[PDB]
């Protein structure tokens, strides 16, 4: 069985004490300095009557102190709720309510709403970090709660094992203590665990991006300056790198694209641009962090009809596609993706919604707790998991369902289409496909292209062009912002 996060960290801190752990600006912090500040801060937090099981929110910009407060909290057994410091105060009130946070630690204590949560100044708590008060800390299990995250807000509870599994080397990545990670993902977003905890729990180094919104070249110079070897990117951020500076994507050894569907020809240009291993992967909030990886072997693997696979599970993770009954699907057979293993969350805030998504199923001589993704998926001829839909991306046309995300892939296979979103609209229901291209195309060309790969009733009525498709600051297409933008 796994250990707790502070247990793995202390074992790493005494094994690689002189290796680099954090890099901010030009300053570097070793695992020994990080362990001392974490041990001192953990005793200070206990002297504020923060005990095991308490829910403490975190609102600190990208700083060396941000990750010390994380390691400090888990040590005392608290459950942290990270919130983006760039988020508006309306969203903070929702998250603090949905998480039931009893405390809040911040570097800007005034830009927050009032409520039942106590507000503490991280600028003050660091001042009281004496080298005297040593403290004594609880014994934590792998199933003890670690942090709380949100998803579109649903409140999700993550255990220690969900992020402690990242301390295991991934065979497809070949990571070790020699590597270096770039922390650019939002802390309130589960993809930041791929960067924070795969580094601090393996002896590797974590490069801290500037706070706020650094631009693309600010990240490109940093990947080259601090020699990042493991780069986790979102769909939109990966789209920008290929368009602008694709050469910077082959400085690291592995690049992992995750979070959303992406035009397959972006992977084709990315793999041809160098010899860095490019990955498509599945990340899920309810499975704590990154969950699967598919290595795009070459441009000849990029195919039509179906998008790029998400691959095979990470260590201590199990993923399987079930059909209309609980049994694995064959090749091509479409079903829903179920996930089990050390990454599965402890549940939602609603005990009934928890039971409607977490089910214990016997599988291979063992009762295993599965989470339902509501992602329609299938397999390829090599048992690589391939996503095709998401359940709420459907609609009835001529009495029969159609897959929204499936038509989007058939449209992206057109060489002129850069990207496309499709919207279900209300008429006395039809499809509206907003496309992007750089060369004037006719909407009859896109419809004629669709008829070669789709029946006549899987073709939208309206095609419109958007100078750009909206993003969510987490790198994925915002179908919500597009609909509200189409209300013009």
Ligand X SMILES: Nc1c(O)cccc1C(=O)NS(=O)(=O)NC[C@H]1O[C@@H](n2cnc3c(N)ncnc32)[C@H](O)[C@@H]1O
Q: What are 337's two structure tokens?
A: 């993706």
CB of 207 to ligand X, least distance (A): 18
Tally Cβ neighbours within 10 Å of residue 390. 16
Which C-beta is closer to ligand X: that of 187 or that of 387? 387
Candidates 68-76, 112-120, 136-144, 190-198; binding stretch for ligand X (CB under 6 A): 190-198
CB of 191 to ligand X, least distance (A): 4
Candidates 91-99, 115-123, 208-216, 253-261; binding stretch for ligand X (CB under 6 A): 253-261
Contact between 258 and ligand X (CB under 6 A)?
yes
Among 375, 408, 418, 419, binds ligand X (CB under 6 A): 375
CB of 1 to ligand X, least distance (A): 23
Which C-beta is closer to ligand X: that of 145 or that of 264? 264
Candidates 120-128, 169-177, 186-194, 242-250; binding stretch for ligand X (CB under 6 A): 186-194
Candidates 174-182, 223-231, 259-267, 317-325; binding stretch for ligand X (CB under 6 A): 259-267
Which C-beta is closer to ligand X: that of 65 or that of 408? 408
Residue 164: alpha-carbon gap to chain centroid: 16
Which C-beta is closer to ligand X: that of 159 or that of 310? 310
Q: Which of 360, 346, 392 is nearest to 53 (CA)?
A: 346
Q: Which of 409, 455, 463 is nearest to 431 (CA)?
A: 463
Which C-beta is closer to ligand X: that of 158 or that of 459? 158
The distance in angstroms from the start CA to the end CA of the chain is 56
Among 37, 280, 378, 384, binds ligand X (CB under 6 A): 280
CB of 55 to ligand X, least distance (A): 20
CB of 373 to ligand X, least distance (A): 5
CB of 41 to ligand X, least distance (A): 27
* Stretch 281-340 residues interacting with ligand X (CB under 6 A): 281-285, 289-290, 310
Which C-beta is closer to ligand X: that of 145 or that of 283? 283
* Stretch 49-88 residues interacting with ligand X (CB under 6 A): none
Decide the pairing of beta strands 367-379 and 385-387.
antiparallel
Q: How far is CA 416 from CA 91, 438, 445, in A?
A: 38, 8, 10
Which C-beta is closer to ligand X: that of 62 or that of 376? 376
* Stretch 379-398 residues interacting with ligand X (CB under 6 A): 387, 390
Q: Which residue is nearest to ligand X (CB)?
A: 283
Q: Return the sign of the alpha-carbon dihedral for residues 396, 401, 406, 412.
A: negative
Candidates 38-46, 168-176, 278-286, 456-464; binding stretch for ligand X (CB under 6 A): 278-286
Q: What are 390's two structure tokens?
A: 């998401």
Contact (Cβ atoms closer than 8 angstroms) between residue 79 and residue 35:
no
Per-residue binding letters, 112-151, with ligand X (x by CB under 6 A): ---------------------------------------x
Contact (Cβ atoms closer than 8 angstroms) between residue 6 and residue 71:
yes
Per-residue binding letters, 193-232, with ligand X (x by CB under 6 A): -x--------------------------------------
Spatial separation of the C-alpha atoms in residues 329 and 311, rounded to whole Å = 15
User: Which residues sit at the interface with ligand X, rule CB under 6 A?
Assistant: 151, 190-191, 194, 258-261, 280-285, 289-290, 310, 373, 375, 387, 390
């Amino acid at each position: 069985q796994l250990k707790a996060v502070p247990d793995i960290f202390d074992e790493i801190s005494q094994r690689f004490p002189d290796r680099v752990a954090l890099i901010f600006d030009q300053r570097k912090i070793t695992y020994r300095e990080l362990a001392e500040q974490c041990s001192a801060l953990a005793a200070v937090l206990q002297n504020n009557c923060l005990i095991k099981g308490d829910i403490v929110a975190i609102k600190i910009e990208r700083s060396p102190e941000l990750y010390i407060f994380m390691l400090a909290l888990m040590k005392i057994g608290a459950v942290m709720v990270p919130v983006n410091s760039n988020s508006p105060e309306r969203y903070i009130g929702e998250v603090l309510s949905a998480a039931g946070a009893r405390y809040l630690i911040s570097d800007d204590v005034t830009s927050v709403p009032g409520g039942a949560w106590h507000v503490l100044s991280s600028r003050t708590l660091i001042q009281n970090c004496t080298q005297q008060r040593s403290g004594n800390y609880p014994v934590l299990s792998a199933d003890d709660p670690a942090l709380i995250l949100m998803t579109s807000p649903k409140s999700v509870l993550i255990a220690h094992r969900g992020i402690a599994r990242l301390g295991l080397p991934v065979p497809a990545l070949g990571n070790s203590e020699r590597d270096c990670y770039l922390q650019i993902a939002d802390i309130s977003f589960a993809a930041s665990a791929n960067e924070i905890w795969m580094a601090l729990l393996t002896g590797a180094c974590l490069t801290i991006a500037p706070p706020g919104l650094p631009d693309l070249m600010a990240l490109a110079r940093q990947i080259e300056s601090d020699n990042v070897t493991m780069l986790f990117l979102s769909g939109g951020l990966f789209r920008l790198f290929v368009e602008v500076s694709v050469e910077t994507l082959h400085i690291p050894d592995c690049v992992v694209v995750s979070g959303d569907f992406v035009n397959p020809r972006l992977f084709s240009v990315a793999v041809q641009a160098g010899k860095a291993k490019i990955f498509n992967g599945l990340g899920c909030t309810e499975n704590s962090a990154i969950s699967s990886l598919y290595h795009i072997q070459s441009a000849a693997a990029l195919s039509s009809e179906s998008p790029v696979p998400v691959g095979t599970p990470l260590p201590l993770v199990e993923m399987v596609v079930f059909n209309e009954r609980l049994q694995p699907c064959t090749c091509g057979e479409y079903g829903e993706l179920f996930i089990a293993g050390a990454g599965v969350a402890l549940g939602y805030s609603d005990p009934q919604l928890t039971a409607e998504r977490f089910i214990t199923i016997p599988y291979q001589g063992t009762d295993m707790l599965f989470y339902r993704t509501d992602d329609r998926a299938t397999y390829d001829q090599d048992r690589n998991i391939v996503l095709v839909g998401r359940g709420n991306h459907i609609c009835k046309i001529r009495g029969f369902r159609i897959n929204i995300a499936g038509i989007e892939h058939l449209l992206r296979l057109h060489h002129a289409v850069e990207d496309v979103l499709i919207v279900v609209e209300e008429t006395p229901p039809r499809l509206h496909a907003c496309y992007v291209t750089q060369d004037g195309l006719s909407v009859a060309d896109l419809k004629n292209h669709l008829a070669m790969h789709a029946p006549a009733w899987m073709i939208p009525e309206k095609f419109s062009r958007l100078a750009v498709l909206p993003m969510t600051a987490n790198g994925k297409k915002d179908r919500l912002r597009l609909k509200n933008s189409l209300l013009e």
